[PDB]
Amino acid sequence: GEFVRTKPHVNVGTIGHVDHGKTTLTAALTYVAAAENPNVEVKDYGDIDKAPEERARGITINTAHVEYETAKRHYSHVDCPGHADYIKNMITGAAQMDGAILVVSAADGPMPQTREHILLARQVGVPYIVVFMNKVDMVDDPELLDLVEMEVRDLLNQYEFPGDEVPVIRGSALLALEQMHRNPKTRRGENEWVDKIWELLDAIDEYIPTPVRDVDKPFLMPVEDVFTITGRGTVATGRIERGKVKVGDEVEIVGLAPETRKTVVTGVEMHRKTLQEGIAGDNVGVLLRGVSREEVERGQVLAKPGSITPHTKFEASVYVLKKEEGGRHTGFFSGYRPQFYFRTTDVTGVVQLPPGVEMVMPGDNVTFTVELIKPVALEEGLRFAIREGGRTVGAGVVTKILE
Ligand SMILES: Nc1nc2c(ncn2[C@@H]2O[C@H](COP(=O)(O)OP(=O)(O)NP(=O)(O)O)[C@@H](O)[C@H]2O)c(=O)[nH]1
Ligand SMILES: [Mg+2]
Numbered sequence: 001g002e003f004v005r006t007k008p009h010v011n012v013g014t015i016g017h018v019d020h021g022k023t024t025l026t027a028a029l030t031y032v033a034a035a036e037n038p039n040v041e042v043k044d045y046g047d048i049d050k051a052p053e054e055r056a057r058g059i060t061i062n063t064a065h066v067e068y069e070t071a072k073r074h075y076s077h078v079d080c081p082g083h084a085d086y087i088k089n090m091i092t093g094a095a096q097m098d099g100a101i102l103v104v105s106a107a108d109g110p111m112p113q114t115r116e117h118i119l120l121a122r123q124v125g126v127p128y129i130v131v132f133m134n135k136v137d138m139v140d141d142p143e144l145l146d147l148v149e150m151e152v153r154d155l156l157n158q159y160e161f162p163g164d165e166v167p168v169i170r171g172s173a174l175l176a177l178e179q180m181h182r183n184p185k186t187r188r189g190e191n192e193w194v195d196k197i198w199e200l201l202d203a204i205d206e207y208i209p210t211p212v213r214d215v216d217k218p219f220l221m222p223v224e225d226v227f228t229i230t231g232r233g234t235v236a237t238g239r240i241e242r243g244k245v246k247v248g249d250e251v252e253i254v255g256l257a258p259e260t261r262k263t264v265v266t267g268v269e270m271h272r273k274t275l276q277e278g279i280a281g282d283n284v285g286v287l288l289r290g291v292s293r294e295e296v297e298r299g300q301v302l303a304k305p306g307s308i309t310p311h312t313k314f315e316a317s318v319y320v321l322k323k324e325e326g327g328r329h330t331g332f333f334s335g336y337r338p339q340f341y342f343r344t345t346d347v348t349g350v351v352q353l354p355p356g357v358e359m360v361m362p363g364d365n366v367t368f369t370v371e372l373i374k375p376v377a378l379e380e381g382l383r384f385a386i387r388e389g390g391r392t393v394g395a396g397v398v399t400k401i402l403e
């Protein structure tokens with residue numbers, strides 16, 4: 001139907017190591033919220049991990065977006081894969097979050113992608129984290145639980161999150177999900193597992209603030225995914241970063257292609273509900289006229305025409321991870337060609353070191369220039385991650401644009 005704004009909107013999502021329970025939690029959240037609010041459609045496990053390749057491999061691969069709401073706010077929730085081979089998709093999801101739910105298995109404790117997701121969430125600008133300690137149903141010993149919490153809090157401190165301050169909710173996504181299946185009308189106060197989900201929801205309501213958003217600046221929406229709707233056309237999805245978009249607006253597709261191209265917006269939706277106007281913070285799908293799904297792609301940005309100039313070469317201040325932070329064992333030279341991650345963009349770039357800087361070692365803080373093989377929407381102060389051969393190697397921020 002039509003989208004009615006009644007509440008402040010916030011984007012959250014789930015991150016954390018493979019199998020720790022991100023998707024089960026995502027599903028439990030929709031079920032628990034739906035019992036209090038009739039506007040919430042429940043999403044089952046299989047509705048989220050829906051792709052044939054996900055069924056085949058038994059993991060989340062694609063980000064999924066689900067909707068739910070509390071009395072306080074409206075939420076779009078991005079569920080991210082935890083598998084190490086799909087970090088690229090996790091980063092794109094994280095780039096949409098005003099807050100992340102870090103799911104950590106009580107039975108396993110923090111694992112390498114617990115660490116890596118925290119680090120990367122930061123480098124695409126996730127400002128707040130709530131922790132959900134999942135699978136406590138499997139853990140008898142309260143001392144392990146305390147140990148796990150202790151480890152998570154400290155790990156978050158390592159990446160300059162306020163680890164001692166974040167809410168840590170202990171529960172079981174699966175047992176809440178099960179209770180909601182047996183009684184979908186189960187309200188708060190009736191069941192201890194479901195009430196842990198309410199504890200998570202309260203914590204999200206109150207600890208993750210509604211972001212300050214600029215609706216007056218030029219329209220800008222990083223593209224997350226692109227698909228063809230049969231009978232309607234090409235839809236580009238994403239979180240609107242700033243400004244507003246209305247059906248009928250001309251927009252520019254910026255980045256990744258040699259030339260910027262224009263199109264007209266012909267539809268705007270949030271969770272398959274019609275938006276009169278999309279605004280900063282909205283998680284939308286934008287129908288684009290006269291372009292195929294081979295002419296818009298992840299990592300481009302939709303922008304007010306002439307508001308953004310795509311760039312290829314910049315200076316950056318970079319920290320290179322130590323091996324004990326998931327980084328590489330050895331260093332690199334000029335000519336190193338890793339992947340660079342800016343918002344939803346992933347682009348091969350060439351490290352070019354200063355005269356005199358022969359080598360960069362793990363644990364170094366350094367400045368160098370980068371040349372991307374494709375132009376990308378960039379600006380000074382933009383944070384980015386560096387990855388190569390399937391591992392995270394560094395974090396940086398743009399200091400100056402050059403070309
Ligand atoms: N005992 C127990 N098992 C749980 C709980 N939540 C999830 N699981 C189990 O843990 C496994 C992984 O759950 P899932 O939600 O797919 O985790 P994920 O983090 O989304 N995986 P991925 O990283 O691939 O996206 C499943 O077998 C699921 O039933 C829980 O609260 N308790
Ligand atoms: Mg999953």
Ligand SMILES: [N+]
Pocket residue numbers: 048049050054060061062063064
């Ligand atoms: N998924």
